[PDB]
Amino acid sequence: KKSSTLQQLISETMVRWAQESVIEDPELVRAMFVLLHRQYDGIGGLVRALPKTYTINGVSVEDTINLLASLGQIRSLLSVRMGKEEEKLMIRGLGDIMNNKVFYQHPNLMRALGMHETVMEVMVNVLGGGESKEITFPKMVANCCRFLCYFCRISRQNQKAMFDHLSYLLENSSVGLASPAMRGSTPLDVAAASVMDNNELALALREPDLEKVVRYLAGCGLQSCQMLVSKGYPDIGWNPVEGERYLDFLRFAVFCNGESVEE
Amino acid sequence: LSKKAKASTVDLPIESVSLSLQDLIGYFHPPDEHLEHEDKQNRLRALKNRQNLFQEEGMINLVLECIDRLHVYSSAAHFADVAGREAGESWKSILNSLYELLAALIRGNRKNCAQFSGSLDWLISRLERLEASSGILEVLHCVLVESPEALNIIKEGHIKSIISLLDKHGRNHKVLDVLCSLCVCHGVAVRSNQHLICDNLLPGRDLLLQTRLVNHVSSMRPNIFLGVSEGSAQYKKWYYELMVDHTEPFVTAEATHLRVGWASTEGYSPYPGGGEEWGGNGVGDDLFSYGFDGLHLWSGCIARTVSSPNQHLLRTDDVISCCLDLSAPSISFRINGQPVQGMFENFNIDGLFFPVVSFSAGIKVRFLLGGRHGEFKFLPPPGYAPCYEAVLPKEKLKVEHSREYKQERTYTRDLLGPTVSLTQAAFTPIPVDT
Amino acid sequence: GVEIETISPGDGRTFPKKGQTCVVHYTGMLQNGKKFDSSRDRNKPFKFRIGKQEVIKGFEEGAAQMSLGQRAKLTCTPDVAYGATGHPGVIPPNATLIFDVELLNLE
Amino acid sequence: LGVAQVGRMNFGKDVSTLKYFTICGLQEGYEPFAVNTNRDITMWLSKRLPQFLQVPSNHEHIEVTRIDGTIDSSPCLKVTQKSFGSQNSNTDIMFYRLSMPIECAEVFSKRDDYDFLMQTSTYYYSVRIFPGQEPANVWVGWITSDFHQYDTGFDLDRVRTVTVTLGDEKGKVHESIKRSNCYMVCAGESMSPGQGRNNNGLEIGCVVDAASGLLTFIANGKELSTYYQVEPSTKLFPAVFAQATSPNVFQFELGRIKNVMPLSAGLFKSEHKNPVPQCPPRLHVQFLSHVLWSRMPNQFLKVDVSRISERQGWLVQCLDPLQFMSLHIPEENRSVDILELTEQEELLKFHYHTLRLYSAVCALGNHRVAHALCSHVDEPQLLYAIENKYMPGLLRAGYYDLLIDIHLSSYATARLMMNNEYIVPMTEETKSITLFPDENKKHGLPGIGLSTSLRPRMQFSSPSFVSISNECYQYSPEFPLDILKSKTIQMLTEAVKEGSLHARDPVGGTTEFLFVPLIKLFYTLLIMGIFHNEDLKHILQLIEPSVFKEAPKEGLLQMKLPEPVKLQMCLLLQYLCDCQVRHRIEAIVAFS
Amino acid sequence: QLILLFSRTALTEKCKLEEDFLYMAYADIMAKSCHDEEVKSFEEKEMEKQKLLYQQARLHDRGAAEMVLQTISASKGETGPMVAATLKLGIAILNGGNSTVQQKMLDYLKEKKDVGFFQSLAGLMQSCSVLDLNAFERQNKAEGLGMVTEEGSGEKVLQDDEFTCDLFRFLQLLCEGHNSDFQNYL
């Protein structure tokens, strides 16, 4: 009889169009075959959706709505260029997210929503915009790093999830080490928090990361600090200010919970 | 030449430079659309490699100094005064070709458009001059569409110069495209540029075309065509009266239209003069019509406020009496028997006059033309004659559309050609000389 | 301040009082005649409460001087509404705004 | 049509109307011009009223050349009679004007000094009557936008004038205003000594005071007696009316005299405080011509006229509203119907790109810019543009895009962002959810059903500019999501019915222009979730009748759509599949 | 048309081969269709071989060999899921030493003068992984301390065992049947 089902209707229509005409538009071809593949692989929709499915109690519905609105603002800020207003909006959103009780009660929900990735990506955009010109919008990088460190400290699983991006944080490490009053709010601090007091993560830490940190420390011990000498500091031949930060990270890398990770 | 060496001593390879620029344009010519996908991709790869090699050898800069050394002279005549006259003609062509060369060198290449950011400010400083505006605009468009980094240095002054390009060089869609590229690049919106473009372009309402939704206005007139001329039998004073039976102040969002008065034809033709056949134009929107809306005297699309006891816009059960004096050009009104404190004077009396009313939707009015057709609720002023007395004897007084075309079935519509002049309107007796 | 010319008369006895919100349909026009706002276009009557400084001052005293059911024209000088900054994107700097205001209801 | 001639065209929209088609034309295979059109063809007629347009470069009689101004000279525009002294040359009076006007002040206040020179509002331009051209045939001065007179013989006595004499209660005329479209003088009478002037071409200088409206004329260094006083806000176009008696007739010398701004400082806002005379490319000579077409409206106002009786006179009654959008050219002080852009390509392109710029400035949730744009493009304008069937395709697509970008893009994006995430509250109505509507294992219609998954909140702010609050800058401007919904459903149904007949004239000129914007708006509304229950059932029946029967006409899927329309249909099908997936997820959560 | 879409995407100019979900799914579907897998009769074995030939023909008739060469060439020696799926598709179409597929691949490479294919092959070989005593010892230390394993397999040692086997099986299947042309071209 008739199709009687959206799956059958789409599967017939896509093939009929494709065999009727040679589709010129690659986007049209992709859309057609994506629909056909989705219709044929019905179980794939479930295997993709279920990981992003969370159930909440009825009492916390309004707080979940508020947290979702804040996260929507944060995600929407990914599509706009940085500015003073964007800085203010993200401080708003991050403060509200921190104050929300769901942020302390459902860590799996926040991991599934992928807000640590969103905050990291925004901080990445900020850092990549004017990376050489010191650090533009220091409050964005500081608040992003503080929120990310708090995310690591909330739960061990959150710490592992953030540790999964430790590699890139290391290329984005040498950003705000020299400037004081921002201590504890740099991507190096975020990496240290991801590896802090976790034997699994310390053991899984790879040699190339330590080599990167060692090269940074060697550079700081070899050449002076451009920002400090530009502000007028005496031109000693090396950079104790950043060398101390790198040594502090290496301390957490090597030492964990009273014992020393020999590897 | 700048150091003022003798023209004979200075050797400008003008012909070779132009020919090489043409060769370079052909060498960096983009792939054609009709080509197959594989050949297109191969030629795009070759173009990308050529652009990388040129930029790495620093050809972008060399083109920049060539452009600067050409702009040290103001015009082609000036360059022909300094250098040779043949170089004077070739100055425009070389200057254009260099700009197309720069555009082809940087087009679609992220690295080149990124390195062009430093000179981007220098590029926009010559956008105002006419000899290079098109090439500079094309290069600017390529840089903006390709390099996100270039948008980070565009400032308020740079945007205002681009808008002044609209202001001075007229309407152009390419600069609008450049502005859109400034607003959005690669799916990321720059709020600063959006706000500046908005606040610097929109409020003026002097460059972009403006749009507004306007009610249709139709004009209705009697058959009479009264005028004044030497040695002809027409009474120079006339009077008619209009009653408003119902009026909706706002049938739509826009205010309703209701104006009454007199209109004058151009010459002795029967057409109303100086006004569009259809649109939102009514009585008083041209210099051939003279209207009254209850608060303003309308003529030439400009309104003057007139005082009247308990003045108000024309409502239901409002009576307007119109008076015309062609002995000394004068148009006076009387609302509800009360005289309005203003009149039209010393207008043009070359053509014929007739009563006219202009309205939008939601209007229900009645002409009181006097005598058989109606009775005046107010006594006519002394001398003034009722308007029905001007009807030619055989014809019948009819209130018909002032304009030719009305709402009717499409294929039954009567297309009307030019009409003849009403020489019969002014019966001027001309006996032969004896 | 503001100049008020009456298009349609009102009752002439009921005027806005302190703390009483006014329901008005208005049309905003620049001095040259260009329209920039219309509650009639938005098809929603505009409600503001007299004297909380929530509407431009000229509109405020114009509505105050108007009576119930009256249709009046409000001419607001630059100083009384959007003095020098103007409205970004709508009202140019130093612009006089003409408003066609009708006091629909008082509550 | 000749003089006093009447005729009718029958394009055969209704074949029965054609009277001789059957006996000749039908068997031969000729088809009526309107063989299958859902709407009548727009007539275009010859415009009676002349308009000012730029002199064509290929004009057979007029030559206009721009002379760049040196340091010792001034920018000059020269009008040249190309075919003078030649066969078929035209000796009639030609009317010239400059493109941009000088705008007088809104309210009238009641070597050279730089301070006075910068604070003054007086502007000046001069015209050089070339030697050998009779000054009696040349008139110099200003005109307004209303000047549309093309009398072969022109004199200053027959200019259109009126005198509005406002008076007090007693009748005393406290003020009288002379209003005219033309304020010009004749050079022949202006030159006082007469005869010999060959020492330099007759230089009539026009001086305009934008703060007082005083128009004074300088002729060969001496003020003329004739002066014109104009009323505030008058836009005066520099104009010269001349009859060619020499190949060189006159020259627009755009310069300055002592203590006066040049004409450019008044014409252009960017050059307001620049005393140096300038002639930007925008300014150019325009001549009055008859070569222009006019478009008859498809629909006219319905007016009923009848004599009630001898007492009641004649009744004029118009009770049905009718509207059209007017495109206002700011520089020319002229307005034309937006549907006239079907033949004006340059204006159509410029306005389409203006619409695209409007869409771009408010892109990605620039709510305050959207609020500002609500002033320039309003709700009635958007609705009329959406519904009108005679709109050009480009403008139609632009207005459909602008509506979505200003009012719907933000929330549509928010729901698309929160579309792959299923936060399902554990409530009683959630527990009630089941995979299948009844015991019989038949799928319900997609979209219809109780969905309890968390959604973003719909919030909008009213765009009022009299308010001085700033909370309105959050949230997109409000729009009637119900009137828009019903209109979209109706237009989709009409498009489905009409397009199946394959008419020669679709809305916008092409099937793509007809369908892509409409389906895009429909998809945006579907994403936003406005459609509920019955509307969703109707729009599903529109998509495909047979599959979505509750519990011949062929749908869009088999309507044989173009590729751009097929992409939108793929998007709609993707949304329906996503709705099914969400229903499955909620049913699983309910069972759990 | 689907194969042509994928081939054009592979041949388009990019610095890096972007991960495409559509390709990663449809290549797997095509590979499954190709292979489609107690002692059986000679007739049954011949019917299996002939059925496999027809199943492989349904793709290499439409240009799958060129597609799987182009994707590997555009990979530019970067190990990834796209290359892992492409190698599986190539193995599926080349199973049994398909001489027609071998000839098609050889002719395509020779006429295109494709150097990126071989450069990417070498790069994939260098990027292939091996046993790591350090990783094994660290993982065993984690197990001995008894912390719950963060991942079930713990496949840090021999990161991708399937990718290497597929990469070398593809290269063997290329030369199977004593194909001297590949034996010399490689």
Residue numbers in the entry:
A (entry chain D): 2053 to 2315
B (entry chain D): 436 to 869
C (entry chain H): 2 to 108
D (entry chain D): 1207 to 1316, 1414 to 1854, 1889 to 1929
E (entry chain D): 3666 to 3702, 3710 to 3858
Quoted passage from the original study:
Ryanodine receptor type 2 (RyR2), an intracellular Ca2+ release channel located on the sarcoplasmic reticulum (SR) of cardiomyocytes, is essential for cardiac muscle excitation-contraction coupling. Dysregulation of Ca2+ handling, characterized by aberrant SR Ca2+ leak, is a pivotal pathophysiological mechanism in a spectrum of cardiac disorders, including heart failure (HF), atrial fibrillation, catecholaminergic polymorphic ventricular tachycardia (CPVT), and other arrhythmogenic disorders. Here, we solved the cryogenic electron microscopy structures of ryanodine receptor 2 variants linked either to heart failure or inherited sudden cardiac death.
RyR2-S2808D channels were recombinantly expressed in HEK-293 cells and isolated as previously reported. We determined the cryo-EM structures of the RyR2-S2808D channels under conditions that resemble diastole in the heart when cardiomyocytes are at rest (concentration of free cytosolic Ca2+ below 150 nM and ATP in the mM range). Treatment with the Rycal drug ARM210 reversed these structural changes in RyR2-S2808D, resulting in a conformation of the cytoplasmic shell that is more upward-inward than the closed state of WT RyR2 (RMSD = -0.08).
